[PDB]
Amino acid sequence: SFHISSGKDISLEEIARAARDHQPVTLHDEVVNRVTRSRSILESMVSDERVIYGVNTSMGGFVNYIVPIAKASELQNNLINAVATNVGKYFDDTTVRATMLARIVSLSRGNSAISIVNFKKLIEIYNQGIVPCIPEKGSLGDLGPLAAIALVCTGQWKARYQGEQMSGAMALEKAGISPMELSFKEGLALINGTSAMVGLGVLLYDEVKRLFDTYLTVTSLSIEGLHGKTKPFEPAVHRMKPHQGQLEVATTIWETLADSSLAVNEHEVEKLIAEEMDGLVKASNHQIEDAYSIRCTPQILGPVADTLKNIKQTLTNELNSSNDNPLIDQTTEEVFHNGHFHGQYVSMAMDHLNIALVTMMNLANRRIDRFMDKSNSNGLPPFLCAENAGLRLGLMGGQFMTASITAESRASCMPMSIQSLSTTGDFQDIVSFGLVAARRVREQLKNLKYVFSFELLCACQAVDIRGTAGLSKRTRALYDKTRTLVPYLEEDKTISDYIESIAQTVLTKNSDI
Amino acid sequence: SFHISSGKDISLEEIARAARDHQPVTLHDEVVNRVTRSRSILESMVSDERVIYGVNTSMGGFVNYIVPIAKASELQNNLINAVATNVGKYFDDTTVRATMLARIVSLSRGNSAISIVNFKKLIEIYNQGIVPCIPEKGSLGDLGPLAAIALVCTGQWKARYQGEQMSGAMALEKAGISPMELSFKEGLALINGTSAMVGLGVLLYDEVKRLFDTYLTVTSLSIEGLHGKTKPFEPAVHRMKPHQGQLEVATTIWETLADSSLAVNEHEVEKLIAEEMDGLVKASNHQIEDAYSIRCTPQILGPVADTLKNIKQTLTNELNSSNDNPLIDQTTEEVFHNGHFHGQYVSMAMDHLNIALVTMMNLANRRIDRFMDKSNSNGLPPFLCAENAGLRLGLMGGQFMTASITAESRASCMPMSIQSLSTTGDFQDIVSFGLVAARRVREQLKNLKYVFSFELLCACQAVDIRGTAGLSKRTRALYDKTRTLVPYLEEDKTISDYIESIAQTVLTKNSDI
Numbered sequence A, B: 001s002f003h004i005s006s007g008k009d010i011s012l013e014e015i016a017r018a019a020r021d022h023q024p025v026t027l028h029d030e031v032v033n034r035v036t037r038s039r040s041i042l043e044s045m046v047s048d049e050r051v052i053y054g055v056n057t058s059m060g061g062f063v064n065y066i067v068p069i070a071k072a073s074e075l076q077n078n079l080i081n082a083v084a085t086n087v088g089k090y091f092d093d094t095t096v097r098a099t100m101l102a103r104i105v106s107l108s109r110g111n112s113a114i115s116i117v118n119f120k121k122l123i124e125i126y127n128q129g130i131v132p133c134i135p136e137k138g139s140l141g142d143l144g145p146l147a148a149i150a151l152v153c154t155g156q157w158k159a160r161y162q163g164e165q166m167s168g169a170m171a172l173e174k175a176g177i178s179p180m181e182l183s184f185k186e187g188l189a190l191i192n193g194t195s196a197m198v199g200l201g202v203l204l205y206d207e208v209k210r211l212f213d214t215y216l217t218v219t220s221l222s223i224e225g226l227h228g229k230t231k232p233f234e235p236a237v238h239r240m241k242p243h244q245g246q247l248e249v250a251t252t253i254w255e256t257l258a259d260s261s262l263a264v265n266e267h268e269v270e271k272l273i274a275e276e277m278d279g280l281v282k283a284s285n286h287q288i289e290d291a292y293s294i295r296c297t298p299q300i301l302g303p304v305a306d307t308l309k310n311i312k313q314t315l316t317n318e319l320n321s322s323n324d325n326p327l328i329d330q331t332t333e334e335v336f337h338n339g340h341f342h343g344q345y346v347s348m349a350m351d352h353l354n355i356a357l358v359t360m361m362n363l364a365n366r367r368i369d370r371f372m373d374k375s376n377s378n379g380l381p382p383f384l385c386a387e388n389a390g391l392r393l394g395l396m397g398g399q400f401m402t403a404s405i406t407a408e409s410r411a412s413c414m415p416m417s418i419q420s421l422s423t424t425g426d427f428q429d430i431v432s433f434g435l436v437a438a439r440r441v442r443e444q445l446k447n448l449k450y451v452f453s454f455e456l457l458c459a460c461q462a463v464d465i466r467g468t469a470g471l472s473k474r475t476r477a478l479y480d481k482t483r484t485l486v487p488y489l490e491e492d493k494t495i496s497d498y499i500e501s502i503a504q505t506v507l508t509k510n511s512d513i
């Protein structure tokens, strides 16, 4: 189970695992009491004739309209229907689950004044496995996406339950749940915050961080394949800049290659060159240092590791927040109108994640050109075609795939968090587009795994050609796992399925994404 | 003076001020001894027949060429000429100064093995006020820019000295300095790192952080102008999300507006609406909460403040680093080939700064539409034209300026740190473009001040129209300073010069940028 207790923050790793595995939510007692008290406070404010948005006023474009408390249910049902205007394909079950868990987390903090009955119902709908159909396109940053959920919670719209699409009412009946009856604030509290962009955003972070870690082992395997030198990865020289991500990356690679005899000892190369010295300017077959896609790996992936730490922190904070409006402070029993639904932090974080993904993409696209071009590959056969070159083209065509997906990805990396357009009579006049920002990352992550897959495919074929006796233990593990999906290739063969296989099996944890 | 002492890190604020003011560099004794020892170690390595890039090998495309120690001077002079291939307009004096101070900082750490004589000469050339002419376009991320400097240091190329452009040799003679004589490694050590993108990058950070701080007071003045409510800025509701930049932004605005009577007390508005309540659905002239460009200001500028903290840290770390190759560790007397010249951290930081600038731009462009459109301005006259509307157009045309520069800026925000193209026989196969990334930020910052200038111009005219008796102390200070440059406008007048004046005098610290 995914346990929510008061004041204990939820980690990205926990919510990603809960959403991938459909872990049930369980609540600590104090969470129940806080959610309940928040509603009691609101009710007492309504008796005190407080004026509160979405309780006795209308919303969005009609912010200035008074609406009687007696008409609450009807206003809340109108609200969740009116803003459910997303279109296009439906989110997968894992993203839907993550979204609803992020909403449950936000509401659990006791500042939203959702009733305890509807809060438990939201959890129960989640627990029993109902997955509202959430159309992916539209929304300003997540009314659309969350209103698709609120509608299913009330016995409307559509959902998947046990592998079948059916009406919201059919799914509730099958799951054994009565639909929610919404009173004042309640529609608003279920739909007014950042939970879709968070739910998608967290699942993307978790996937990316995992792929990054794996890619340091793909890198180490490349370096063995290219006979790159390991001395530039020594932690001692990286402690000469205070960048933390760089020093971590170099340390991991350095430790992974410590027992390789494929990776090259710079001191051995230095000796070869010193022995050629005779007081003349002349060319050598050896070179004291390698090309940047090898030697600059820590300086290039270090910023990626560091921007991942910052993204993790922003997502963690946005997940562990009261992203809803208005909000009730239980200590002072005060109500605040505020802007906590605004997704700018997540949207910005997504644009940074997009940039990080394309930076990794360029690196791996460039590794691939090192393997393909015999002038760059440090003694490997052209196109890694070891037998019958000319009669066969070898792996030359994989680069047609990667350079194209890299180019497409570079063109797709325009920041969404700056694209704000004003709507709703200019009430929503500056908006994040955080969920579009996250959907665009998701596309770029698919691209990244394709290009990674071909670097790894190259690296395996390259070490086969070098001889694998000298592989490090950790890189040999990766080489082995890949060799269970793709053979050494001594004849020309379509690699489309091989690449899909490595992407799916080596480079993926969350297969729904 | 700008004092360099061993192991004490230099702050961005100090190097920005040194570069703006042409503070002289002074050295702590230990820095002198460390720089000297680094050279002695290298010399002893050369005697030991070590093979070291740029000392007895050639560089870039000719990495694999052995070059005799006897030919060192000639190789280093060839190197600084061959890579000085920048074109276009010359960097201003402040950016040039910052660049050379960042280089001096990097070399001061004692890992570069530049001679103590050439190190002191670099400082002396800086101190006496010689400013090498550095063409801004070109370079992969800063051989071009730093080789323009290295050439002037050796009595070549061109420089500005005492307000005149002249040859490098003329400027040295006038300043009383003998040109540098370069021995092995020395050309390479002067040009091989990140100092131009750092020098520009730091000057941009400092300017931006200052403009941000000022813009929180421009915001507070806007909110007074628009009669926005201050309750959504209360720190208590912002502590309901753990985002630090957001809570800081709201706190600053909340404290700045504490003594305003122009900004609106939400409780007063709540009372007005409660008094209109009569059990019917109906429209009110009052609304319990405001549009996002007012109420979401902390949620929008908070990510900007937070990404500024991360940028500050990356720049601080890159400034306080040994960004040079190869490097000597003095403890173990070991030499490392490495990738520490790679600007990926700065280039990525610049792309984030670009995004932050456009996010602020959208916000202020949107504030401007609140002032211009009487449906949005909460009781201000259309286009802030209080007298003779129709006969006069008022300030309506300023928005033609800002929407255009905002649109242009949005189109210019494609990340440069992903644009890598391979060169140099694929030795430089993955590159940062960090200096282009910084130059593009610089352009966006000019744009930002134009749009800010018109928001502030609007805000002043708006509070004049409200009556300024109720201004907060801090916002009245800003209103006053602006009113020394631009009057209240009761007739139609070209604002081009007014806007330039506010940009230059209110919104600028570093006038060279």
Ligand SMILES: *N[C@@H](CC(=O)O)c1ccccc1
Pocket (backbone or CB within 6 Å): A059, A060, A061, A083, A192, A325, A326, A341, A424, B289
């Ligand atoms: N997200 C709500 C606005 C607010 O909370 O200030 C909203 C906006 C538009 C329509 C319904 C609800």
Ligand SMILES: *N[C@@H](CC(=O)O)c1ccccc1
Pocket (backbone or CB within 6 Å): A289, B059, B060, B061, B083, B192, B325, B326, B341, B424
């Ligand atoms: N920046 C140098 C390369 C290295 O240090 O590895 C370089 C690159 C090209 C030409 C000259 C020097």
